Amino acid sequence: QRPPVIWIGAQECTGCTESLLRATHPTVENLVLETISLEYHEVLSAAFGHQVEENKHNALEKYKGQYVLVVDGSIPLKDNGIYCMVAGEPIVDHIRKAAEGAAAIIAIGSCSAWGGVAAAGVNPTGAVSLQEVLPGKTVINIPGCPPNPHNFLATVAHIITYGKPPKLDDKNRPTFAYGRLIHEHCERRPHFDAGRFAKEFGDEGHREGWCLYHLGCKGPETYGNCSTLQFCDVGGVWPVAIGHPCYGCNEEGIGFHKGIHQLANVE
Amino acid sequence: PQRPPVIWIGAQECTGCTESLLRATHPTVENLVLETISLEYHEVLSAAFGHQVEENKHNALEKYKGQYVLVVDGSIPLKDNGIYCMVAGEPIVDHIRKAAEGAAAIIAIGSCSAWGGVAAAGVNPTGAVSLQEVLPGKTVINIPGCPPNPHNFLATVAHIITYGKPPKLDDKNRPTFAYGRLIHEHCERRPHFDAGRFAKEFGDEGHREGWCLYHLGCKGPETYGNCSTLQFCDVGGVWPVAIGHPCYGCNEEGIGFHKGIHQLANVE
Amino acid sequence: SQRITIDPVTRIQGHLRIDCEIENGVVSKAWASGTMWRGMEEIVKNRDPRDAWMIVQRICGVCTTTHALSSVRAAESALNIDVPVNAQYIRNIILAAHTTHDHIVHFYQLSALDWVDITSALQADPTKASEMLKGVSTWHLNSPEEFTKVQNKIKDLVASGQLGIFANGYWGHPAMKLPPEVNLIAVAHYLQALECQRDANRVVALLGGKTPHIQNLAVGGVANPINLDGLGVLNLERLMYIKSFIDKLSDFVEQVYKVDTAVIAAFYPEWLTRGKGAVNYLSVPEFPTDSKNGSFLFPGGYIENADLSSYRPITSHSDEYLIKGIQESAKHSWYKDEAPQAPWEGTTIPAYDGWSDDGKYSWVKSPTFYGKTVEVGPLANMLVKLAAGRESTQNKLNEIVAIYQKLTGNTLEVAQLHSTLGRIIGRTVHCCELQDILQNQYSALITNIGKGDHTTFVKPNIPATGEFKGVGFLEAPRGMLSHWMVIKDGIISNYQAVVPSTWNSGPRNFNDDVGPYEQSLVGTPVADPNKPLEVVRTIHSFDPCMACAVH
Amino acid sequence: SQRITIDPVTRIQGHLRIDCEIENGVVSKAWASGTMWRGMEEIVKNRDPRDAWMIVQRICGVCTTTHALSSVRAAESALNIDVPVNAQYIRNIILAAHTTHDHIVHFYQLSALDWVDITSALQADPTKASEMLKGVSTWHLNSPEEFTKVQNKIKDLVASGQLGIFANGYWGHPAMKLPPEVNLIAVAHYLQALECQRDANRVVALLGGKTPHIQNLAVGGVANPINLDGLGVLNLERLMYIKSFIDKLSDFVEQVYKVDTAVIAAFYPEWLTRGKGAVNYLSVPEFPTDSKNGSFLFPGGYIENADLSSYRPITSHSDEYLIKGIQESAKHSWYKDEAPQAPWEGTTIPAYDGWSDDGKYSWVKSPTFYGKTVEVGPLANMLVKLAAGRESTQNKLNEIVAIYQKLTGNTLEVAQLHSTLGRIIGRTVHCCELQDILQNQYSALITNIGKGDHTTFVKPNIPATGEFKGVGFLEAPRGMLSHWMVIKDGIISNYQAVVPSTWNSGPRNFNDDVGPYEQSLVGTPVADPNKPLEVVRTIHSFDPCMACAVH
């Protein structure tokens, strides 16, 4: 038997699910056939409608106290929950019901971790984080927009293999992935130190791989593993290595708040 | 459609430089030999042996005069009239000079052919020297490392094929895309160096947090290369420092195979 | 009649409810409802025009890249910026590779379980399955041994009692028509698809900086630094690596996906005669290749009343006829202002009042083109290409028809493309033609860099006063996308996205005319009203994306 | 009667010359010569013991890892260091994965073109070729479609007129016995082998820091920092990535390489009765799993006069019986000091004087064990494992024999393993058993980390006075390897490597006894003395590595 997972999307863009389709360890096919039993996921489920709601209800009962609950997207509280309705009920109700029997609860992505883009600006829907809707529960936050999928997958694997979550920081983020500032482990730090800065995309410094601080890099104020784990497992691929500043998408108050070219504060 | 011919000669080689090709992904070795080039001579993979393979080489040198890329791995031993490497009864230095005469471009792949490498280190028992030393009238493109990432070589050959000239080279005739910068001037552990966050011994608390390896002997401050950016094997995140071991300076003459692992680098 | 609701519709992006009235087992009327809103248009307002693309890209992660690219095109339109050609090549490679992943995942992971019965695959003979494909495909992974391995994976999953994503599927439903062997083949291909789509996104990642959600755009071009001789930038080694993944896509696309599309049509020919959503079709040209945001590799146009011979070509993203025709209404949507609005004057003022059959019932707006309902997406884009006499499109369609004819003895006429299966076919044709786009644009990039052009970015200036308006068009995987930006005193004063699934999924409009999803369902046979598989088959053919539709 | 020279021998590592006297169409006498020397033992002298491994790893890049590991074991032996068990698991995974790459490349890239005629593959029927493997392999890439694609690649290469490394091969030679279909199957597998070996080396790289030439060792353990919760170090995500590659190796090894081995024996059964090199065999135990450099997963031992029943087990790398038996002579080698030398007292003083049939003719020394010539390598290690009653080895051999049985109606006895084909078989069995070593050691590492042991390194001390002798044994891909370090006044005062290809390729010894290569060739039929394919067949079976043999 494989450990059960229930995945509910709230105000999600599906990018966090899509991250799984880039993963290699495990690939999404090995995740769903070998690693876990994905008991509810609306993107992939054969069943729809009343049949898939029956699957969820049956799984919540059969696996009570055993499943990992995962949520992507923010949860909208304005106007009594009506900005996300599934099977005629506010998604916040579905989430609180599923949370009652969960062994572990994960907020995958910046939206569920801290509200993310959906809670930015004027916040039209009163979008909030998963932790905000589950005050009695310890929610493990795996931020990023979307995170590298293995930030999630190795968190799940730690729960499965060793029986507990990975070590967390004071935002309940796994330290293996979020324990250090990007700027405190960035390969362009020597250029920062020397005052070697790209000033515009396509300029001479930019075309030599110089530091992107003066383009608005938010590496100095964003915790993450983007410079080390990077993305897609091909080698050498993260925003800064491709030539664009970090936007701070991991980090509340940075991504989706600060402008791309706004300068970060440096510690 | 005809593929550009390549002649590969191994001198005092360990075969690690050929073996780097078997890790390559762009192109893979099978695509290299079937699609990108015509590998006219390579003793590791050749169906023919002995008289038949020396015949392949002589025929190819004549047929593709002025057109082929010559590649050499290993150092070339000059002591005692060249007898420390003899192929088909003749010193490898002579095979190399003969093949160099008709070459369109000449590449020293690896630190041994680029600057003598490990085979020339210490007392240099065989009077091993670099490819450029045996070919003083020729421009030799140097692709150092022990062995280099194979794409440091493959993208140099691709530049020659696709755009008709070598890539841009530094003052040691090393391609700038791969060797243009010190490892320490593009190392992700630089923030730790800057803060004085150093591993002191393997397995210690700092080392287990991914701190800078300078005090373990890291030669990144005196070694030109792309090991921290291009890294190795195309899996992501794989180079010696990322794994937990200091750079030994294997790319760089006077560093790798000269200085102790734990000897400290000079910082600029 | 009987009233049913399908909520949630699964194997789509996002939150969709479909309601149907059923008369004597035939759908007589339907309602489509997007049930989640974020207000992404309001979120992006009052910011620097340069910042919009990073925010609005998050409209959707399935069609990642698309809103990023439309947004920068919209700002570039407002500012009158001509994008450097190298930036076009890079944008084009990203969009084509992304769309390759998107379409493959749609056919297999999203749609195949409408048509394929996994329990029937357990009864298959793997050797007979393999023999069925002899002379039909040259794919290298159709052996009995491959199929036995796949069969055993299914067997092991069923034996565990933990069916997960496969639990309570429509196994043995009367509308499942494939033989055991063909069901087994399809499962093998579903798994193999996952490898191909991963390679497509490796292309995207190497230029975008990651995927989902690329990070290499700018108003004025791209952030990739082109320098063949540079360490740590877009050099020849990196370009070779990108090419290595481009080269891995074609065989699966041509020898698996294209073939499976013909075969599904061969076994389900009734589905060539239902699911017509509209009589008008729109697509925009795509893949610009000149220095002035034009010279598109794929053509666009407008077809009215299904007449290909009288269609109107669209060859520019600045076409005033296209721009002036587009409006959206909220008469039957949960917004306050109901009369049709041009998007530069659009509002998005929420006004939720619950479901009403005759009133408001969706967060999706209702777009029209000069007052008509229009279907967008791969059926539209295929029909426009056929109307344009694009040989590449006609030839690719003819390859699918030839396989279909080998299996059935029948041909396919254009009339039969106005249907659920025609929509699927259009998508497959698109994916196939996109492989040549990738080769073309990689070669263009290498060639241009070789001439000494390394330029990628034109730094914009944004006047601090004045009001000006821009629109960015893009032919997305699901159809024509447009982002509409108004800038006033240097910041975004209005932002409206009109997204392809908005055209297709929108509710009844200001004149109570029915949108494509709703129209397509009229006439659908429903054998079991508790398990309306037939309704979902037609809806999935449109590749719904509700984060896109509603934003 | 005539004398031939094969120089260079290709499809090996390094520089080898083979001379043969042929009489009455059979080889009557042979000479093996290593024709390149570097002096690696001298290069490493007078350095810090901790530095040696990075230098002597460069003895060989085909058997990369092996000299690094033997060197640290030698320093650890001199210093009396017990290696942390996590460091053993990591060392073991690297050696097992490396050896998997190494053996696969030997069977396909190095040896197959002795047995396989590519020209004949052009005449094959791909469908008949595929049919031949029904019930013989479950490999998923044996379809006629795969084989047609491969045949077209060969066709296109031949059509170009640039055969390159396939030019002037031994096509149509009378000793080529495979049917066209089997030749095609082999070329398809040759290409597939390249993907599997790449995956094996991805395992190596993730722990070694790169490959070729790993960089994660130390005298005292390894440089990998184990911390499941650490950013930038060996955490659970990195371990999962390693496992993902370990899991990709088994199917090719079991369903292609293992089966091809049985098939080559079935078509070439005469090669079970030739190429015996010795009557004595040595291997060392390998893959230590305890905290004190022992508890090996694979056993070692010494077989004298082919008697398995009375073999001597070797269970420790500190076994004085093994240590005291090993000597090398340079009577027929180009060094000054000729009498047999124990390696702690060894010299390597060059004394080149040209070739002489009865004098010095090689840079390879001549090793003996208590004065006897010994074969090392996979034949030795299989025979020792059979002598030990190791069930895993018996069972794996039996699988190969059962395929041979099915194809021929004949069985294979242990007496037939003392042969060119037996040698190949032992290598294949080793590769197959190594996949369980990988699974075992990965699981042991995960489990131990879970107990709270993250220890990887114990910092050594090296007394500044005193003389200390250490020996590091390792069972390399080509056989028993040993590095012998003497430390005096804190620096290396002597360093001697005795390498497996030294044992096998070494020239006539102090008592003019013939080494395994030279012995194995006596009796070889040679149909065409100008194209002595049969000699190269037997020589390749030993997997020569001359940078290793000579150093």
Ligand code: SF4
């Ligand atoms: S975190 Fe980002 S990728 Fe994930 S749901 Fe939110 S917007 Fe989408």
Ligand code: SF4
């Ligand atoms: S500002 Fe950004 S690019 Fe520069 S060193 Fe810091 S994280 Fe790296």
Ligand code: SF4
């Ligand atoms: S450079 Fe290194 S890998 Fe290449 S031949 Fe020399 S020792 Fe071997």
Ligand code: SF4
């Ligand atoms: S000393 Fe080495 S590990 Fe430290 S920053 Fe420099 S190159 Fe990186």
Ligand code: FCO
């Ligand atoms: N494709 C796509 Fe998403 C939708 N609908 C957009 O644009």
Ligand code: FCO
């Ligand atoms: N295997 C190997 Fe190399 C040899 N001979 C060593 O040790």
Ligand code: F3S
């Ligand atoms: S924008 Fe996000 S993906 Fe990483 S590089 Fe910055 S935290």
Ligand code: F3S
């Ligand atoms: S030892 Fe060599 S491989 Fe790179 S990290 Fe240092 S130059």
Ligand SMILES: [Mg+2]
């Ligand atoms: Mg809108």
Ligand SMILES: [Mg+2]
């Ligand atoms: Mg020796």
Ligand code: NI
């Ligand atoms: Ni979308």
Ligand code: NI
């Ligand atoms: Ni070797």
